[PDB]
Amino acid sequence: VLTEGNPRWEQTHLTYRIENYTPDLPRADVDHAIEKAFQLWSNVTPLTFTKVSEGQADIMISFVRGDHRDNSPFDGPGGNLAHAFQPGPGIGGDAHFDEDERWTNNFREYNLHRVAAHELGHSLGLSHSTDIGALMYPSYTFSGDVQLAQDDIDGIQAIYGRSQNPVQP
Ligand SMILES: [Ca+2]
Ligand SMILES: [Zn+2]
Ligand SMILES: [Zn+2]
DSSP: OOSSSSOSSSSEEEEEEEEEOOOTSOOHHHHHHHHHHHHHHHHHHHEEEEEOOSSSSSSSEEEEOOOOOOSSSOOSSSSSSEEEEOOOOOTOEEEEEEESSOBBBSSSSSSSSHHHHHHHHHHHHHOOOSSSSSTTTTSSOOOOOOOOOOHHHHHHHHHOOOOOOOOOO
């Protein structure tokens, strides 16, 4: 047990990179969905996320289909719609999205941002909850706009703290 409890990120700032954009949606709209999710978490936490166009990033995001050299192949549109590894070296922190399902940004079948935000919850060590107003709810539900819940804000803030930032005149 090198780290006490679950391995938490020692740095207060993290970086991320998109390995590739699926032809499911234009990259311009995918960056907005992913960029908006990180901003929401950083908005209520002193944590910061910066996109990198080169070099290895703390969080790697990519899209894969069927079996992709992993011990958890997707079983058709059934099973989980995506998954991620625990925050750690090697494949740890990586997050894959099932490109077999059709991703959308409206009342369609599913919202890509809702699933992306859920993956971040697991990456930050956040667990599911019985609060229907929480995005990490086990059952998928259309809530329209995606916003964090007080239960989730207090949870991530308790681990790190409040986003205090005394600005000078
Ligand atoms: Ca699936
Ligand atoms: Zn995968
Ligand atoms: Zn989950």
